[PDB]
Amino acid sequence: VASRPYANVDAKPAESAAITILNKNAAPANLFWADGSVELMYGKLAFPTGQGPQVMTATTEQGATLIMSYAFDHIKGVTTARFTTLYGCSVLVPEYTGIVIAGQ
Amino acid sequence: PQVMTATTEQGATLIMSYAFDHIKGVTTARFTTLYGCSVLVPEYTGIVIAGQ
């Protein structure tokens, strides 16, 4: 009874109710959403400054934070550069999002 | 690495050093001290043990 305000389908399945697969063939998806469901989390790893290598921060133009870090090995005479980023894509309300597939 | 000097309760020197490896993705932290314990005249020292 406490689930009734949260209902999303008009009835429970019949006994041995058949399943129909929509993706009969492999196909590329066209994606649809209403805003606020599809999200990127952006985070920064704690690469320390002052300890060892040079560390500094930038962003992509889409707003994701990037760490650039440079370590110089003076014996082989080489800097190694690492660019790194931490993120999480999520769909918070998968009802606000749909797809169209052609070729079945 | 980053290096600091500190002093213990006994006045001994601590070195703290921190090294970040950006390929491994870790800091390693080392605390270290150098000392010698000396009993110059083992006749000037004694012990009592109870319970035999």
PDB file of C-alpha atoms in Angstrom:
ATOM      1  CA  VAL A   1       0.000   0.000   0.000  1.00  0.00           C
ATOM      2  CA  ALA A   2       2.835   2.484   0.762  1.00  0.00           C
ATOM      3  CA  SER A   3       4.110   1.916  -2.834  1.00  0.00           C
ATOM      4  CA  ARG A   4       0.783   3.038  -4.463  1.00  0.00           C
ATOM      5  CA  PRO A   5       1.652   6.819  -4.637  1.00  0.00           C
ATOM      6  CA  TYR A   6       4.904   5.765  -6.430  1.00  0.00           C
ATOM      7  CA  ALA A   7       3.236   3.492  -9.046  1.00  0.00           C
ATOM      8  CA  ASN A   8       4.440   3.816 -12.686  1.00  0.00           C
ATOM      9  CA  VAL A   9       2.532   1.032 -14.588  1.00  0.00           C
ATOM     10  CA  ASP A  10      -1.201   0.304 -14.836  1.00  0.00           C
ATOM     11  CA  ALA A  11      -1.033  -3.426 -13.904  1.00  0.00           C
ATOM     12  CA  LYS A  12       1.207  -6.308 -12.726  1.00  0.00           C
ATOM     13  CA  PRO A  13       2.344  -8.824 -15.466  1.00  0.00           C
ATOM     14  CA  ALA A  14       0.146 -11.852 -16.238  1.00  0.00           C
ATOM     15  CA  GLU A  15       1.544 -15.345 -15.503  1.00  0.00           C
ATOM     16  CA  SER A  16       4.148 -16.125 -18.235  1.00  0.00           C
ATOM     17  CA  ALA A  17       3.476 -12.737 -19.943  1.00  0.00           C
ATOM     18  CA  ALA A  18       5.461 -12.533 -23.215  1.00  0.00           C
ATOM     19  CA  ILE A  19       8.515 -10.280 -23.733  1.00  0.00           C
ATOM     20  CA  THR A  20       8.956  -8.285 -26.992  1.00  0.00           C
ATOM     21  CA  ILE A  21      12.504  -7.022 -27.779  1.00  0.00           C
ATOM     22  CA  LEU A  22      12.559  -3.584 -29.499  1.00  0.00           C
ATOM     23  CA  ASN A  23      16.193  -3.779 -30.748  1.00  0.00           C
ATOM     24  CA  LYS A  24      15.646  -6.549 -33.395  1.00  0.00           C
ATOM     25  CA  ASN A  25      18.882  -5.368 -35.125  1.00  0.00           C
ATOM     26  CA  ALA A  26      21.975  -3.511 -33.864  1.00  0.00           C
ATOM     27  CA  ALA A  27      21.490   0.244 -34.498  1.00  0.00           C
ATOM     28  CA  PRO A  28      22.884   3.688 -33.503  1.00  0.00           C
ATOM     29  CA  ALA A  29      20.687   5.587 -31.016  1.00  0.00           C
ATOM     30  CA  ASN A  30      19.314   9.125 -31.362  1.00  0.00           C
ATOM     31  CA  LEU A  31      19.003  10.527 -27.807  1.00  0.00           C
ATOM     32  CA  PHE A  32      16.216  12.665 -26.270  1.00  0.00           C
ATOM     33  CA  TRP A  33      15.865  14.275 -22.843  1.00  0.00           C
ATOM     34  CA  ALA A  34      14.071  16.827 -20.704  1.00  0.00           C
ATOM     35  CA  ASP A  35      16.677  18.939 -18.836  1.00  0.00           C
ATOM     36  CA  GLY A  36      17.890  18.103 -15.283  1.00  0.00           C
ATOM     37  CA  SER A  37      17.958  14.255 -15.577  1.00  0.00           C
ATOM     38  CA  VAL A  38      21.258  13.815 -17.492  1.00  0.00           C
ATOM     39  CA  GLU A  39      24.280  15.012 -15.514  1.00  0.00           C
ATOM     40  CA  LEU A  40      28.078  15.091 -15.225  1.00  0.00           C
ATOM     41  CA  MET A  41      29.676  15.122 -11.790  1.00  0.00           C
ATOM     42  CA  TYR A  42      33.105  16.791 -11.896  1.00  0.00           C
ATOM     43  CA  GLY A  43      35.802  16.158  -9.251  1.00  0.00           C
ATOM     44  CA  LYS A  44      39.510  16.952  -8.678  1.00  0.00           C
ATOM     45  CA  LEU A  45      42.047  14.388  -7.375  1.00  0.00           C
ATOM     46  CA  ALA A  46      44.439  15.804  -4.732  1.00  0.00           C
ATOM     47  CA  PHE A  47      47.722  15.866  -6.670  1.00  0.00           C
ATOM     48  CA  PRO A  48      49.977  17.653  -4.088  1.00  0.00           C
ATOM     49  CA  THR A  49      51.863  20.845  -4.920  1.00  0.00           C
ATOM     50  CA  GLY A  50      55.395  21.359  -3.425  1.00  0.00           C
ATOM     51  CA  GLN A  51      56.013  17.577  -3.064  1.00  0.00           C
ATOM     52  CA  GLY A  52      58.095  16.436  -6.102  1.00  0.00           C
ATOM     53  CA  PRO A  53      56.552  17.386  -9.534  1.00  0.00           C
ATOM     54  CA  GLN A  54      54.971  20.606 -10.792  1.00  0.00           C
ATOM     55  CA  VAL A  55      51.140  20.446 -10.512  1.00  0.00           C
ATOM     56  CA  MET A  56      48.573  22.898 -11.925  1.00  0.00           C
ATOM     57  CA  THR A  57      44.848  22.979 -12.831  1.00  0.00           C
ATOM     58  CA  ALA A  58      42.755  23.977 -15.876  1.00  0.00           C
ATOM     59  CA  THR A  59      39.288  23.226 -17.329  1.00  0.00           C
ATOM     60  CA  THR A  60      37.883  21.965 -20.591  1.00  0.00           C
ATOM     61  CA  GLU A  61      35.500  24.486 -22.259  1.00  0.00           C
ATOM     62  CA  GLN A  62      32.599  22.144 -21.220  1.00  0.00           C
ATOM     63  CA  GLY A  63      33.710  22.857 -17.579  1.00  0.00           C
ATOM     64  CA  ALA A  64      35.419  19.566 -16.518  1.00  0.00           C
ATOM     65  CA  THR A  65      38.520  20.174 -14.308  1.00  0.00           C
ATOM     66  CA  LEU A  66      41.911  18.903 -15.573  1.00  0.00           C
ATOM     67  CA  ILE A  67      45.115  18.437 -13.584  1.00  0.00           C
ATOM     68  CA  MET A  68      48.373  18.851 -15.523  1.00  0.00           C
ATOM     69  CA  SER A  69      51.458  17.497 -13.759  1.00  0.00           C
ATOM     70  CA  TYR A  70      55.084  17.526 -14.939  1.00  0.00           C
ATOM     71  CA  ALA A  71      57.968  15.484 -13.484  1.00  0.00           C
ATOM     72  CA  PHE A  72      61.526  16.036 -14.811  1.00  0.00           C
ATOM     73  CA  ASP A  73      64.042  13.165 -14.665  1.00  0.00           C
ATOM     74  CA  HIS A  74      67.395  14.981 -14.980  1.00  0.00           C
ATOM     75  CA  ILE A  75      69.334  11.679 -15.516  1.00  0.00           C
ATOM     76  CA  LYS A  76      67.541  10.665 -18.756  1.00  0.00           C
ATOM     77  CA  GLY A  77      66.864  14.395 -19.433  1.00  0.00           C
ATOM     78  CA  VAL A  78      63.066  14.003 -19.911  1.00  0.00           C
ATOM     79  CA  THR A  79      59.891  15.603 -18.567  1.00  0.00           C
ATOM     80  CA  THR A  80      56.880  13.288 -18.391  1.00  0.00           C
ATOM     81  CA  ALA A  81      53.548  15.147 -18.509  1.00  0.00           C
ATOM     82  CA  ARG A  82      50.315  13.593 -17.146  1.00  0.00           C
ATOM     83  CA  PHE A  83      46.939  15.193 -17.869  1.00  0.00           C
ATOM     84  CA  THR A  84      44.147  13.685 -15.719  1.00  0.00           C
ATOM     85  CA  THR A  85      40.435  14.199 -14.916  1.00  0.00           C
ATOM     86  CA  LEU A  86      37.780  12.647 -12.609  1.00  0.00           C
ATOM     87  CA  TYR A  87      34.079  12.621 -13.621  1.00  0.00           C
ATOM     88  CA  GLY A  88      30.825  10.653 -13.345  1.00  0.00           C
ATOM     89  CA  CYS A  89      28.034  10.619 -15.915  1.00  0.00           C
ATOM     90  CA  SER A  90      24.574   9.714 -14.502  1.00  0.00           C
ATOM     91  CA  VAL A  91      20.866   9.615 -15.475  1.00  0.00           C
ATOM     92  CA  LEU A  92      18.997  10.665 -12.320  1.00  0.00           C
ATOM     93  CA  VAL A  93      15.473  10.259 -13.807  1.00  0.00           C
ATOM     94  CA  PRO A  94      15.610   7.716 -16.704  1.00  0.00           C
ATOM     95  CA  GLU A  95      11.909   8.513 -17.500  1.00  0.00           C
ATOM     96  CA  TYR A  96      12.980  12.064 -18.595  1.00  0.00           C
ATOM     97  CA  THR A  97      15.185  10.377 -21.279  1.00  0.00           C
ATOM     98  CA  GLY A  98      14.359   8.364 -24.406  1.00  0.00           C
ATOM     99  CA  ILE A  99      15.827   7.088 -27.701  1.00  0.00           C
ATOM    100  CA  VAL A 100      14.870   6.532 -31.366  1.00  0.00           C
ATOM    101  CA  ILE A 101      16.409   3.579 -33.254  1.00  0.00           C
ATOM    102  CA  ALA A 102      15.919   3.060 -37.013  1.00  0.00           C
ATOM    103  CA  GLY A 103      16.569  -0.189 -38.992  1.00  0.00           C
ATOM    104  CA  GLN A 104      14.632  -1.736 -36.048  1.00  0.00           C
TER     105      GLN A 104
ATOM    106  CA  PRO B   1      60.604  15.740  -1.969  1.00  0.00           C
ATOM    107  CA  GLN B   2      59.308  18.334   0.493  1.00  0.00           C
ATOM    108  CA  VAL B   3      61.438  18.133   3.719  1.00  0.00           C
ATOM    109  CA  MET B   4      60.763  19.429   7.288  1.00  0.00           C
ATOM    110  CA  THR B   5      62.702  19.194  10.582  1.00  0.00           C
ATOM    111  CA  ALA B   6      60.949  18.699  13.979  1.00  0.00           C
ATOM    112  CA  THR B   7      61.954  17.885  17.619  1.00  0.00           C
ATOM    113  CA  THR B   8      60.695  14.992  19.850  1.00  0.00           C
ATOM    114  CA  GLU B   9      59.827  15.031  23.595  1.00  0.00           C
ATOM    115  CA  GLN B  10      63.472  13.987  24.308  1.00  0.00           C
ATOM    116  CA  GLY B  11      64.920  16.743  22.044  1.00  0.00           C
ATOM    117  CA  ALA B  12      65.791  14.242  19.250  1.00  0.00           C
ATOM    118  CA  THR B  13      65.589  15.478  15.625  1.00  0.00           C
ATOM    119  CA  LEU B  14      62.830  14.167  13.339  1.00  0.00           C
ATOM    120  CA  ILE B  15      63.037  14.585   9.577  1.00  0.00           C
ATOM    121  CA  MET B  16      59.671  14.425   7.774  1.00  0.00           C
ATOM    122  CA  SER B  17      59.782  14.068   3.964  1.00  0.00           C
ATOM    123  CA  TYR B  18      56.984  13.790   1.384  1.00  0.00           C
ATOM    124  CA  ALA B  19      57.496  12.531  -2.196  1.00  0.00           C
ATOM    125  CA  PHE B  20      54.617  12.531  -4.734  1.00  0.00           C
ATOM    126  CA  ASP B  21      54.903  10.098  -7.670  1.00  0.00           C
ATOM    127  CA  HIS B  22      52.461  11.441 -10.288  1.00  0.00           C
ATOM    128  CA  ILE B  23      52.558   8.205 -12.425  1.00  0.00           C
ATOM    129  CA  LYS B  24      51.842   5.893  -9.441  1.00  0.00           C
ATOM    130  CA  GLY B  25      49.392   8.578  -8.165  1.00  0.00           C
ATOM    131  CA  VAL B  26      50.641   8.374  -4.514  1.00  0.00           C
ATOM    132  CA  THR B  27      52.500  10.405  -1.942  1.00  0.00           C
ATOM    133  CA  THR B  28      54.992   8.482   0.167  1.00  0.00           C
ATOM    134  CA  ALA B  29      55.581  10.020   3.610  1.00  0.00           C
ATOM    135  CA  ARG B  30      58.775   9.201   5.580  1.00  0.00           C
ATOM    136  CA  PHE B  31      59.423  10.180   9.202  1.00  0.00           C
ATOM    137  CA  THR B  32      63.030   9.400  10.301  1.00  0.00           C
ATOM    138  CA  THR B  33      65.473   9.899  13.222  1.00  0.00           C
ATOM    139  CA  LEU B  34      69.115   8.966  14.011  1.00  0.00           C
ATOM    140  CA  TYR B  35      70.292   8.262  17.594  1.00  0.00           C
ATOM    141  CA  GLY B  36      72.540   6.090  19.791  1.00  0.00           C
ATOM    142  CA  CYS B  37      71.735   4.707  23.264  1.00  0.00           C
ATOM    143  CA  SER B  38      74.866   4.522  25.448  1.00  0.00           C
ATOM    144  CA  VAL B  39      75.757   3.119  28.911  1.00  0.00           C
ATOM    145  CA  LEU B  40      79.296   4.442  29.353  1.00  0.00           C
ATOM    146  CA  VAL B  41      79.796   2.943  32.858  1.00  0.00           C
ATOM    147  CA  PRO B  42      77.506  -0.108  33.412  1.00  0.00           C
ATOM    148  CA  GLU B  43      78.533  -0.046  37.138  1.00  0.00           C
ATOM    149  CA  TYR B  44      76.788   3.380  37.541  1.00  0.00           C
ATOM    150  CA  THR B  45      73.496   1.611  36.585  1.00  0.00           C
ATOM    151  CA  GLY B  46      71.399  -1.076  38.308  1.00  0.00           C
ATOM    152  CA  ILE B  47      68.019  -2.839  38.198  1.00  0.00           C
ATOM    153  CA  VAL B  48      65.528  -4.328  40.687  1.00  0.00           C
ATOM    154  CA  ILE B  49      63.244  -7.183  39.556  1.00  0.00           C
ATOM    155  CA  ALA B  50      60.256  -8.177  41.728  1.00  0.00           C
ATOM    156  CA  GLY B  51      58.449 -11.570  41.445  1.00  0.00           C
ATOM    157  CA  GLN B  52      62.071 -12.914  41.275  1.00  0.00           C
TER     158      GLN B  52
END
